[PDB]
Design a protein around this ligand. Structure first.
Ligand code: SF4
Ligand SMILES: [Mg+2]
Lengths: 112, 110, 88
């Protein structure tokens, strides 16, 4: 289902400051950024925590409690590995120049 | 299933299609609604289905409704691709790695 | 599983990192190369309240690294089994 506006804005603000803090950049295609941000928001709405939208889980409540895949996940925090392509290191071929993304960009690129 | 295109399947329609495939190889794209890289590789997956018209290309949304089939097939990374021959999974490819998927299709055909 | 049981038995064991691995979370150390560093397994976590979870770097390993002008800096890094060897 569609995530709440408020959770999307939570996860948008998070993405901006975390990209800045980690020295990473959003994908050249900000549709990819926007889709992942909405997945984080949807998981926050449904499970109580922004579990990685590019992982499959058995027991959601146990994954929320243990926290390994709660964004920013352990591979991102420790190795700067973001397989969702939300936070891209500057050497990555699909890293763009932006560490910001507006609500309008999120809505435009995910309208379809 | 129309071949030359990608057919959406669910937990009830997937295995009968595999059974009906006969000697055709089946490819399955296991995706979720909000995985960015899934959406990146999806058009390339469609082009593979238009090239490999002697194979059956499927996609499965790994949501709550389809979780029993997701659990049976096995998935941790999104995307995950499965290649099936003769009623079983023979190969998997994890991630949105187009060249890895291509190489696995080519290996399965050899 | 036997794998989980034998992994839990390695808690406390000394290990050496056997592959190139850069980490970025060590406080005030922007980048640390772990290959060749020795530490010990602090935890192995694949269960939470008895439910199996899907963490793919299940060994939490404690390291201490000497930093010039700072002394020893203790930190943890999550590893999987093919990234380290038991020391004994
Ligand atoms: S890979 Fe990790 S950091 Fe990237 S979106 Fe998924 S949970 Fe967040
Ligand atoms: Mg045959």
């Amino acid at each position: 289902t569609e995530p709440s506006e408020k959770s999307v804005e939570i996860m948008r603000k998070f993405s901006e400051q975390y990209a800045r803090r980690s020295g990473t950049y959003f994908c050249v295609d900000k549709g990819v950024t926007s889709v992942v941000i909405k997945g984080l928001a949807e998981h926050k709405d449904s499970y109580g925590a922004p579990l990685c939208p590019c992982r499959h889980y058995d027991d959601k409540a146990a994954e929320v409690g243990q926290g390994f895949w709660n964004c920013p996940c352990v591979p991102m925090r420790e190795r700067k590995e973001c397989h969702c392509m939300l936070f891209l290191t500057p050497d990555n071929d699909f890293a763009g120049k932006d560490q910001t993304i507006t609500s309008d960009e999120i809505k435009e690129t995910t309208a379809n | 299933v129309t071949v030359g295109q990608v057919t959406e399947v669910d937990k009830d329609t997937f295995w009968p299609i595999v059974k009906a495939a006969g000697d055709k190889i089946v490819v399955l794209d296991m995706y979720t609604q909000w995985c960015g890289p899934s959406k990146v590789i999806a058009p390339k997956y469609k082009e593979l289905s238009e090239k490999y018209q002697d194979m059956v290309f499927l996609k499965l949304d790994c949501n709550q409704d389809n979780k029993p089939l997701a659990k049976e097939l096995g998935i941790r990374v999104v995307p995950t691709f499965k290649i099936l021959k003769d009623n079983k999974v023979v190969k998997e490819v994890t991630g949105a790695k187009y060249e890895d998927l291509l190489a696995a299709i080519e290996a399965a055909r050899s | 599983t036997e794998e989980d049981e034998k992994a839990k038995e390695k808690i406390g064991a000394r290990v050496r990192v056997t592959v190139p691995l850069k980490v970025y979370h060590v406080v005030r150390v922007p980048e640390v190369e772990l290959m060749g560093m020795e530490g010990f397994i602090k935890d192995y976590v694949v269960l939470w309240k008895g439910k199996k979870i899907s963490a793919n770097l299940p060994f939490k390993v404690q390291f201490v690294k000497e930093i010039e002008g700072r002394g020893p800096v203790k930190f943890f890094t999550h590893l999987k089994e093919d990234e380290f060897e038991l020391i004994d």
